[PDB]
Design a protein around this nucleic acid. Structure first.
Ligand SMILES: C[As](C)(=O)[O-]
Ligand SMILES: [Zn+2]
Length: 180
DNA sequence: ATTTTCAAT
C-alpha cells in the first residue's frame, strides 16, 4: 500500500524547507503518487517515499517501478514531490526512461532547485521537460498534500513556514528562466 | 486564538 517509510514531522519540516540556498540537506526525499489505469480494471493507486541509496532516489524509483510495477496495456500517471531537483545523470536517466516508456506520464514538483546556477544542472532540467515531464516548484498546496500523505502527521494540520510563498516565487522565476 | 504561505522603507 505504502512503498518505503513515511517521514516523522521534524524530518519533513527540515527536508522540505524551501529557502533557495539551505545548508545541511544531504538527503533527497522523493515522495510519489501514481494512478494505475488499465482498460478493463478499476483504476488503482500507489504512494510512497524513496531516499538516496540505482543509488540516487530518482534511480531507486525507476528501478523499483521497472522491477515491480510496469505492465502491458497500462497507463501510469506519476507525480513526484522531491526535496531537491535531479542531478544531470539522474535527469538523463529519467528522460531516457520516459522516451522508452510512452505509457508513463511524469509530473515533478520540487521543493528546491539543486545547483540551479550551474549550466550542467540547467540542461538536466531542460532535457526532462523536453521528454514530456512537467517540472514545477512546490507551492503551499503541494507541501500541504505531502504533509497529509507522506508524513506521520498524527492528524495535525500542515503548518506553513515564514517565507514559503516568497521562496516559491523566487524558485519558480529561476525555473522558468531555465526552461525558457 | 481572527490557528503559523502574505501583512512589506
Ligand atoms: C537530487 As539527487 C543528488 O538524489 O539526483
Ligand atoms: Zn542524481
Amino acid at each position: 500500500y505504502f512503498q518505503g517509510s513515511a517521514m516523522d514531522p521534524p524530518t519533513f519540516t527540515f527536508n522540505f524547507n524551501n529557502e533557495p540556498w539551505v545548508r545541511g540537506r544531504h538527503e533527497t526525499y522523493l515522495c510519489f503518487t501514481m494512478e494505475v489505469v488499465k482498460h478493463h480494471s478499476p483504476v488503482s493507486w500507489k504512494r510512497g517515499v524513496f531516499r538516496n541509496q540505482h543509488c540516487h532516489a530518482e534511480r531507486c524509483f525507476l528501478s523499483w517501478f521497472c522491477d515491480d510495477i510496469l505492465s502491458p496495456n497500462t497507463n501510469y500517471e506519476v507525480t513526484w514531490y522531491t526535496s531537491w531537483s535531479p542531478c544531470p545523470e539522474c535527469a538523463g536517466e529519467v528522460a531516457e526512461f520516459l522516451a522508452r516508456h510512452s505509457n508513463v506520464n511524469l509530473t515533478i514538483f520540487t521543493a528546491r532547485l539543486y545547483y540551479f546556477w550551474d549550466t550542467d544542472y540547467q540542461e538536466g532540467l531542460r532535457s526532462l521537460s523536453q521528454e514530456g515531464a512537467s517540472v514545477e516548484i512546490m507551492g503551499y498546496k503541494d507541501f500541504k498534500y505531502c504533509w497529509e500523505n507522506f508524513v506521520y502527521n498524527d492528524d495535525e494540520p500542515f503548518k506553513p513556514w515564514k517565507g514559503l510563498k516568497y521562496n516559491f516565487l523566487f524558485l519558480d522565476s529561476k525555473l522558468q528562466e531555465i526552461l525558457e
